Amino acid sequence: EAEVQIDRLITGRLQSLQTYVTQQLIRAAEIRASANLAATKMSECVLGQS
Amino acid sequence: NGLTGTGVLTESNKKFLPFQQFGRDIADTTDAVRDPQTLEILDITPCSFG
Amino acid sequence: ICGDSTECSNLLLQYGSFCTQLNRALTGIAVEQDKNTQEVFAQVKQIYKTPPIKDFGGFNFSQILPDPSKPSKRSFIEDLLFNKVTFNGLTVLPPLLTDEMIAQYTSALLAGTITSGWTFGAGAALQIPFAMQMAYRFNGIGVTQNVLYENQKLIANQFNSAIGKIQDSL
Amino acid sequence: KRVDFCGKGYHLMSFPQSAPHGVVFLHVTYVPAHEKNFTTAPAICHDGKAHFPREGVFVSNGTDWFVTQRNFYEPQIITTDNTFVSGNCDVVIGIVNN
Protein backbone atom coordinates (compact mmCIF):
# COMPACT_ATOMS: atom_id res chain seq x y z
CA GLU A 1 0.00 0.00 0.00
CA ALA A 2 3.02 2.28 0.01
CA GLU A 3 2.57 2.09 -3.75
CA VAL A 4 -0.96 3.43 -3.26
CA GLN A 5 0.50 6.33 -1.29
CA ILE A 6 3.01 7.09 -4.06
CA ASP A 7 0.13 6.86 -6.54
CA ARG A 8 -1.66 9.66 -4.67
CA LEU A 9 1.51 11.74 -4.55
CA ILE A 10 2.17 11.13 -8.26
CA THR A 11 -1.28 12.14 -9.44
CA GLY A 12 -1.28 15.29 -7.31
CA ARG A 13 2.16 16.45 -8.40
CA LEU A 14 1.50 15.65 -12.06
CA GLN A 15 -1.72 17.67 -12.02
CA SER A 16 0.10 20.61 -10.45
CA LEU A 17 2.83 20.41 -13.09
CA GLN A 18 0.24 20.34 -15.89
CA THR A 19 -1.48 23.45 -14.54
CA TYR A 20 1.86 25.25 -14.34
CA VAL A 21 2.73 24.29 -17.93
CA THR A 22 -0.62 25.52 -19.26
CA GLN A 23 -0.26 28.86 -17.49
CA GLN A 24 3.25 29.19 -18.93
CA LEU A 25 1.92 28.58 -22.44
CA ILE A 26 -0.75 31.26 -22.07
CA ARG A 27 1.71 33.82 -20.73
CA ALA A 28 4.21 33.05 -23.48
CA ALA A 29 1.55 33.61 -26.13
CA GLU A 30 0.77 37.02 -24.63
CA ILE A 31 4.46 37.93 -24.51
CA ARG A 32 4.89 36.90 -28.15
CA ALA A 33 2.02 39.16 -29.20
CA SER A 34 3.60 42.07 -27.33
CA ALA A 35 6.97 41.35 -28.95
CA ASN A 36 5.42 41.38 -32.41
CA LEU A 37 3.86 44.76 -31.65
CA ALA A 38 7.21 46.08 -30.40
CA ALA A 39 9.01 44.92 -33.54
CA THR A 40 6.42 46.53 -35.80
CA LYS A 41 6.58 49.80 -33.86
CA MET A 42 10.37 49.80 -33.98
CA SER A 43 10.45 49.16 -37.73
CA GLU A 44 7.79 51.74 -38.56
CA CYS A 45 8.70 54.59 -36.18
CA VAL A 46 12.50 54.36 -35.84
CA LEU A 47 13.55 53.49 -39.39
CA GLY A 48 11.09 55.97 -40.89
CA GLN A 49 8.62 58.74 -40.21
CA SER A 50 5.14 57.36 -39.56
CA ASN B 1 18.87 10.77 13.91
CA GLY B 2 16.49 8.88 11.64
CA LEU B 3 16.17 11.78 9.18
CA THR B 4 17.47 10.52 5.84
CA GLY B 5 18.75 12.64 2.97
CA THR B 6 21.39 13.00 0.28
CA GLY B 7 23.75 15.87 -0.41
CA VAL B 8 27.10 17.41 0.50
CA LEU B 9 27.87 18.38 4.10
CA THR B 10 29.72 21.63 4.78
CA GLU B 11 30.50 23.59 7.93
CA SER B 12 28.03 26.46 8.28
CA ASN B 13 28.28 29.77 10.14
CA LYS B 14 24.56 29.99 10.95
CA LYS B 15 23.74 31.15 14.48
CA PHE B 16 21.23 28.78 16.06
CA LEU B 17 19.77 28.97 19.56
CA PRO B 18 20.24 26.21 22.16
CA PHE B 19 16.74 24.79 21.61
CA GLN B 20 16.44 24.21 17.85
CA GLN B 21 17.48 20.98 16.17
CA PHE B 22 17.43 21.72 12.43
CA GLY B 23 16.86 24.92 10.49
CA ARG B 24 15.56 25.66 7.01
CA ASP B 25 14.91 28.53 4.62
CA ILE B 26 11.62 28.09 2.73
CA ALA B 27 9.25 25.55 1.15
CA ASP B 28 10.14 22.78 3.64
CA THR B 29 13.74 22.65 2.42
CA THR B 30 15.98 21.42 5.23
CA ASP B 31 19.20 23.42 5.14
CA ALA B 32 21.24 22.92 8.32
CA VAL B 33 21.13 20.16 10.93
CA ARG B 34 22.83 19.52 14.27
CA ASP B 35 24.56 16.20 14.87
CA PRO B 36 23.53 14.71 18.24
CA GLN B 37 27.04 13.56 19.17
CA THR B 38 28.95 16.79 18.51
CA LEU B 39 26.22 19.47 18.31
CA GLU B 40 27.68 21.14 15.23
CA ILE B 41 25.89 23.51 12.85
CA LEU B 42 26.26 21.59 9.59
CA ASP B 43 24.87 22.47 6.16
CA ILE B 44 23.12 20.55 3.38
CA THR B 45 23.52 21.32 -0.32
CA PRO B 46 22.03 19.19 -3.13
CA CYS B 47 24.44 17.35 -5.39
CA SER B 48 24.87 19.05 -8.75
CA PHE B 49 22.93 17.96 -11.83
CA GLY B 50 21.69 19.27 -15.16
CA ILE C 1 7.87 14.01 -9.04
CA CYS C 2 10.17 11.23 -7.82
CA GLY C 3 13.22 12.99 -6.41
CA ASP C 4 15.63 10.12 -7.14
CA SER C 5 13.55 7.13 -6.07
CA THR C 6 13.52 3.87 -8.01
CA GLU C 7 10.00 2.83 -6.97
CA CYS C 8 8.50 6.18 -7.94
CA SER C 9 10.26 6.01 -11.31
CA ASN C 10 8.91 2.51 -11.93
CA LEU C 11 5.38 3.59 -11.04
CA LEU C 12 5.63 6.70 -13.21
CA LEU C 13 6.91 4.66 -16.15
CA GLN C 14 3.46 3.07 -16.55
CA TYR C 15 1.67 6.42 -16.93
CA GLY C 16 2.54 6.54 -20.61
CA SER C 17 4.63 9.29 -22.15
CA PHE C 18 3.41 12.44 -20.43
CA CYS C 19 6.82 13.94 -19.70
CA THR C 20 8.03 14.15 -23.30
CA GLN C 21 5.24 16.59 -24.15
CA LEU C 22 5.90 18.56 -20.97
CA ASN C 23 9.57 19.02 -21.84
CA ARG C 24 8.77 19.75 -25.49
CA ALA C 25 6.41 22.58 -24.53
CA LEU C 26 9.03 24.31 -22.38
CA THR C 27 11.67 23.89 -25.08
CA GLY C 28 9.34 25.53 -27.58
CA ILE C 29 8.77 28.39 -25.14
CA ALA C 30 12.51 28.97 -24.76
CA VAL C 31 13.18 28.88 -28.50
CA GLU C 32 10.29 31.30 -29.01
CA GLN C 33 11.80 33.70 -26.48
CA ASP C 34 15.14 33.68 -28.28
CA LYS C 35 13.44 34.23 -31.64
CA ASN C 36 11.42 37.12 -30.20
CA THR C 37 14.51 38.95 -28.97
CA GLN C 38 16.46 38.28 -32.16
CA GLU C 39 13.69 39.48 -34.47
CA VAL C 40 12.94 42.58 -32.40
CA PHE C 41 16.53 43.80 -32.06
CA ALA C 42 18.54 42.48 -35.04
CA GLN C 43 17.18 44.94 -37.59
CA VAL C 44 20.38 46.07 -39.36
CA LYS C 45 23.17 44.26 -41.19
CA GLN C 46 26.21 46.32 -40.16
CA ILE C 47 27.39 48.11 -37.03
CA TYR C 48 27.58 51.88 -37.46
CA LYS C 49 29.67 54.29 -35.42
CA THR C 50 29.27 57.98 -34.71
CA PRO C 51 32.05 60.31 -35.90
CA PRO C 52 34.58 61.48 -33.29
CA ILE C 53 33.46 65.11 -33.72
CA LYS C 54 29.83 65.70 -32.76
CA ASP C 55 28.36 68.96 -34.09
CA PHE C 56 24.71 68.19 -34.86
CA GLY C 57 23.54 71.72 -35.58
CA GLY C 58 23.10 72.46 -31.88
CA PHE C 59 21.17 69.36 -30.85
CA ASN C 60 22.78 67.58 -27.90
CA PHE C 61 22.69 63.77 -27.87
CA SER C 62 25.27 63.18 -25.13
CA GLN C 63 22.66 61.72 -22.77
CA ILE C 64 21.78 58.86 -25.13
CA LEU C 65 25.05 58.06 -26.88
CA PRO C 66 27.15 55.34 -25.20
CA ASP C 67 29.88 56.34 -22.77
CA PRO C 68 33.20 54.55 -23.44
CA SER C 69 34.35 55.16 -19.85
CA LYS C 70 31.81 52.72 -18.43
CA PRO C 71 32.76 49.06 -18.98
CA SER C 72 29.17 48.22 -19.94
CA LYS C 73 29.31 50.77 -22.81
CA ARG C 74 25.77 51.82 -21.87
CA SER C 75 24.33 55.32 -21.92
CA PHE C 76 23.04 57.38 -19.01
CA ILE C 77 19.39 56.49 -19.57
CA GLU C 78 20.18 52.80 -19.99
CA ASP C 79 22.00 52.82 -16.65
CA LEU C 80 19.08 54.57 -14.98
CA LEU C 81 16.65 52.02 -16.42
CA PHE C 82 18.79 49.09 -15.32
CA ASN C 83 19.19 50.47 -11.80
CA LYS C 84 15.53 51.43 -11.32
CA VAL C 85 14.12 47.93 -11.90
CA THR C 86 15.00 45.06 -9.56
CA PHE C 87 16.74 23.73 -6.57
CA ASN C 88 14.56 20.63 -6.86
CA GLY C 89 14.83 19.75 -10.54
CA LEU C 90 14.22 23.24 -11.96
CA THR C 91 16.81 25.11 -14.01
CA VAL C 92 17.11 28.54 -15.62
CA LEU C 93 18.77 28.92 -19.00
CA PRO C 94 20.75 32.04 -19.90
CA PRO C 95 19.60 34.16 -22.84
CA LEU C 96 21.30 33.58 -26.17
CA LEU C 97 22.30 37.25 -26.54
CA THR C 98 24.10 38.95 -23.69
CA ASP C 99 23.39 42.55 -22.71
CA GLU C 100 26.50 43.96 -24.40
CA MET C 101 25.31 42.82 -27.83
CA ILE C 102 21.87 44.35 -27.26
CA ALA C 103 23.54 47.62 -26.29
CA GLN C 104 25.68 47.38 -29.42
CA TYR C 105 22.62 46.95 -31.65
CA THR C 106 20.93 49.91 -29.97
CA SER C 107 24.01 52.07 -30.47
CA ALA C 108 24.28 51.05 -34.13
CA LEU C 109 20.61 51.85 -34.73
CA LEU C 110 20.94 55.22 -33.03
CA ALA C 111 24.07 56.18 -34.98
CA GLY C 112 22.50 55.12 -38.27
CA THR C 113 19.31 57.07 -37.67
CA ILE C 114 21.27 60.07 -36.39
CA THR C 115 23.66 60.33 -39.35
CA SER C 116 21.99 58.97 -42.50
CA GLY C 117 18.32 59.56 -41.66
CA TRP C 118 15.93 56.89 -42.91
CA THR C 119 18.04 55.92 -45.93
CA PHE C 120 19.85 53.14 -44.08
CA GLY C 121 16.57 51.27 -43.61
CA ALA C 122 16.26 50.48 -47.32
CA GLY C 123 19.75 50.15 -48.81
CA ALA C 124 23.15 51.67 -48.08
CA ALA C 125 23.32 54.56 -45.64
CA LEU C 126 23.81 57.99 -47.21
CA GLN C 127 25.14 60.84 -45.11
CA ILE C 128 23.10 64.01 -44.62
CA PRO C 129 23.65 67.01 -42.31
CA PHE C 130 21.26 66.84 -39.38
CA ALA C 131 19.55 70.20 -39.87
CA MET C 132 18.31 69.41 -43.37
CA GLN C 133 17.04 66.07 -42.11
CA MET C 134 14.73 67.76 -39.63
CA ALA C 135 13.83 70.05 -42.53
CA TYR C 136 12.66 66.99 -44.48
CA ARG C 137 10.72 65.75 -41.46
CA PHE C 138 8.86 69.05 -41.04
CA ASN C 139 8.15 68.93 -44.76
CA GLY C 140 6.73 65.47 -44.15
CA ILE C 141 4.34 66.50 -41.38
CA GLY C 142 2.94 69.40 -43.43
CA VAL C 143 5.07 72.43 -42.44
CA THR C 144 7.33 74.18 -44.93
CA GLN C 145 11.05 73.89 -44.23
CA ASN C 146 11.35 77.67 -43.81
CA VAL C 147 10.23 77.32 -40.19
CA LEU C 148 13.14 75.14 -39.07
CA TYR C 149 15.79 77.26 -40.77
CA GLU C 150 14.27 80.30 -39.08
CA ASN C 151 13.90 78.83 -35.56
CA GLN C 152 16.72 76.29 -35.36
CA LYS C 153 18.19 77.70 -32.14
CA LEU C 154 14.87 77.75 -30.29
CA ILE C 155 14.02 74.25 -31.52
CA ALA C 156 17.35 72.84 -30.36
CA ASN C 157 17.11 74.58 -26.99
CA GLN C 158 13.63 73.28 -26.23
CA PHE C 159 14.59 69.79 -27.42
CA ASN C 160 17.48 69.86 -24.95
CA SER C 161 15.15 71.07 -22.20
CA ALA C 162 12.72 68.24 -22.98
CA ILE C 163 15.44 65.58 -22.85
CA GLY C 164 16.75 66.99 -19.57
CA LYS C 165 13.26 66.95 -18.07
CA ILE C 166 12.68 63.37 -19.20
CA GLN C 167 15.98 62.31 -17.63
CA ASP C 168 15.02 64.01 -14.37
CA SER C 169 11.56 62.42 -14.35
CA LEU C 170 13.01 58.97 -14.98
CA LYS D 1 3.59 53.45 -47.45
CA ARG D 2 4.44 51.94 -44.06
CA VAL D 3 8.13 51.08 -44.12
CA ASP D 4 9.31 47.46 -44.09
CA PHE D 5 5.76 46.09 -43.95
CA CYS D 6 6.15 44.02 -47.14
CA GLY D 7 9.65 43.85 -48.60
CA LYS D 8 12.88 45.63 -47.67
CA GLY D 9 13.03 48.89 -49.60
CA TYR D 10 10.49 51.10 -51.30
CA HIS D 11 7.47 48.98 -52.19
CA LEU D 12 6.10 48.75 -55.73
CA MET D 13 3.67 45.80 -55.96
CA SER D 14 3.04 42.24 -54.84
CA PHE D 15 1.75 39.00 -56.34
CA PRO D 16 0.04 36.16 -54.43
CA GLN D 17 0.45 32.43 -54.94
CA SER D 18 -1.29 29.53 -53.25
CA ALA D 19 0.27 26.92 -50.99
CA PRO D 20 -0.99 23.69 -49.40
CA HIS D 21 -1.99 25.47 -46.19
CA GLY D 22 -1.02 29.08 -46.77
CA VAL D 23 -0.04 31.87 -49.10
CA VAL D 24 3.18 33.10 -50.70
CA PHE D 25 3.76 36.76 -51.53
CA LEU D 26 6.24 38.01 -54.13
CA HIS D 27 7.13 41.61 -53.28
CA VAL D 28 8.76 43.89 -55.86
CA THR D 29 10.92 46.66 -54.40
CA TYR D 30 13.13 49.50 -55.61
CA VAL D 31 16.66 49.80 -54.19
CA PRO D 32 19.08 52.65 -55.03
CA ALA D 33 22.75 52.06 -55.79
CA HIS D 34 25.93 53.76 -57.05
CA GLU D 35 25.91 56.79 -54.78
CA LYS D 36 28.19 59.80 -55.12
CA ASN D 37 29.56 62.40 -52.71
CA PHE D 38 28.43 66.00 -53.10
CA THR D 39 28.66 69.34 -51.30
CA THR D 40 25.36 70.80 -50.10
CA ALA D 41 23.89 74.00 -48.66
CA PRO D 42 20.52 74.76 -47.04
CA ALA D 43 19.57 77.90 -48.99
CA ILE D 44 20.86 80.43 -51.53
CA CYS D 45 21.34 84.14 -50.86
CA HIS D 46 20.65 86.33 -53.90
CA ASP D 47 20.00 90.09 -53.98
CA GLY D 48 19.79 89.96 -50.19
CA LYS D 49 16.93 87.45 -50.29
CA ALA D 50 16.95 83.79 -49.28
CA HIS D 51 15.88 81.08 -51.72
CA PHE D 52 14.75 77.57 -50.79
CA PRO D 53 13.96 74.68 -53.15
CA ARG D 54 10.35 73.74 -53.84
CA GLU D 55 11.24 70.04 -53.97
CA GLY D 56 14.80 68.76 -54.04
CA VAL D 57 18.17 69.71 -52.61
CA PHE D 58 21.13 71.88 -53.60
CA VAL D 59 24.39 70.25 -54.70
CA SER D 60 27.56 71.15 -56.56
CA ASN D 61 30.35 69.15 -58.18
CA GLY D 62 32.80 71.88 -57.17
CA THR D 63 31.23 74.84 -58.97
CA ASP D 64 27.99 75.86 -60.69
CA TRP D 65 25.51 74.51 -58.08
CA PHE D 66 22.29 72.71 -59.08
CA VAL D 67 18.97 71.54 -57.67
CA THR D 68 18.19 67.84 -57.77
CA GLN D 69 15.53 65.40 -56.67
CA ARG D 70 16.37 63.43 -53.57
CA ASN D 71 16.35 59.78 -54.69
CA PHE D 72 17.99 60.18 -58.11
CA TYR D 73 20.86 62.27 -59.43
CA GLU D 74 19.47 64.67 -62.05
CA PRO D 75 20.94 68.15 -61.72
CA GLN D 76 19.13 71.17 -63.10
CA ILE D 77 19.99 74.84 -63.42
CA ILE D 78 18.69 76.88 -60.48
CA THR D 79 15.73 79.01 -61.55
CA THR D 80 13.01 81.09 -59.91
CA ASP D 81 10.49 78.44 -61.02
CA ASN D 82 11.67 75.67 -58.67
CA THR D 83 12.65 77.93 -55.74
CA PHE D 84 10.75 80.26 -53.42
CA VAL D 85 11.78 83.29 -51.39
CA SER D 86 11.23 83.84 -47.66
CA GLY D 87 13.13 86.53 -45.79
CA ASN D 88 16.62 87.98 -46.06
CA CYS D 89 19.87 86.00 -46.00
CA ASP D 90 20.88 87.00 -42.47
CA VAL D 91 19.57 84.29 -40.12
CA VAL D 92 20.05 80.93 -41.88
CA ILE D 93 23.07 78.92 -40.70
CA GLY D 94 24.77 77.69 -43.86
CA ILE D 95 23.62 80.26 -46.40
CA VAL D 96 25.87 80.50 -49.47
CA ASN D 97 26.31 83.23 -52.08
CA ASN D 98 25.26 82.41 -55.65
Next chain:
Amino acid sequence: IIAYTMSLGAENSVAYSNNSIAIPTNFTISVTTEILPVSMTKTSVDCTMY
Protein backbone atom coordinates in the same frame (compact mmCIF):
# COMPACT_ATOMS: atom_id res chain seq x y z
CA ILE E 1 34.17 21.61 -34.59
CA ILE E 2 35.15 25.06 -33.30
CA ALA E 3 33.34 27.13 -30.68
CA TYR E 4 33.64 30.91 -30.98
CA THR E 5 31.91 34.14 -30.01
CA MET E 6 29.17 35.56 -32.21
CA SER E 7 30.01 38.29 -34.71
CA LEU E 8 27.20 40.83 -34.78
CA GLY E 9 28.09 41.75 -38.35
CA ALA E 10 30.38 44.04 -40.30
CA GLU E 11 31.76 47.33 -39.00
CA ASN E 12 31.92 50.73 -40.68
CA SER E 13 32.15 54.39 -39.73
CA VAL E 14 29.86 56.46 -41.95
CA ALA E 15 31.41 59.67 -43.28
CA TYR E 16 29.41 62.45 -41.63
CA SER E 17 30.05 66.14 -42.27
CA ASN E 18 27.97 69.27 -41.92
CA ASN E 19 28.10 70.17 -45.62
CA SER E 20 28.33 66.85 -47.49
CA ILE E 21 25.67 64.45 -48.78
CA ALA E 22 25.51 61.25 -50.82
CA ILE E 23 23.08 60.88 -53.72
CA PRO E 24 22.32 57.67 -55.67
CA THR E 25 22.79 57.52 -59.43
CA ASN E 26 21.42 54.10 -60.42
CA PHE E 27 18.81 51.64 -59.18
CA THR E 28 17.96 47.95 -58.94
CA ILE E 29 14.64 46.11 -58.75
CA SER E 30 14.35 43.12 -56.43
CA VAL E 31 11.80 40.39 -55.81
CA THR E 32 11.44 38.69 -52.42
CA THR E 33 9.28 35.89 -51.04
CA GLU E 34 7.13 35.70 -47.94
CA ILE E 35 5.36 32.54 -46.71
CA LEU E 36 2.43 32.64 -44.30
CA PRO E 37 0.31 29.74 -43.00
CA VAL E 38 -3.43 30.37 -42.86
CA SER E 39 -4.98 27.04 -41.96
CA MET E 40 -4.50 23.55 -40.55
CA THR E 41 -6.26 20.22 -40.88
CA LYS E 42 -9.74 19.69 -39.45
CA THR E 43 -10.09 16.69 -37.16
CA SER E 44 -13.00 15.12 -35.30
CA VAL E 45 -12.91 12.66 -32.41
CA ASP E 46 -15.59 10.49 -30.80
CA CYS E 47 -15.52 9.56 -27.12
CA THR E 48 -17.23 6.18 -26.84
CA MET E 49 -15.13 4.86 -29.71
CA TYR E 50 -11.90 6.23 -28.25
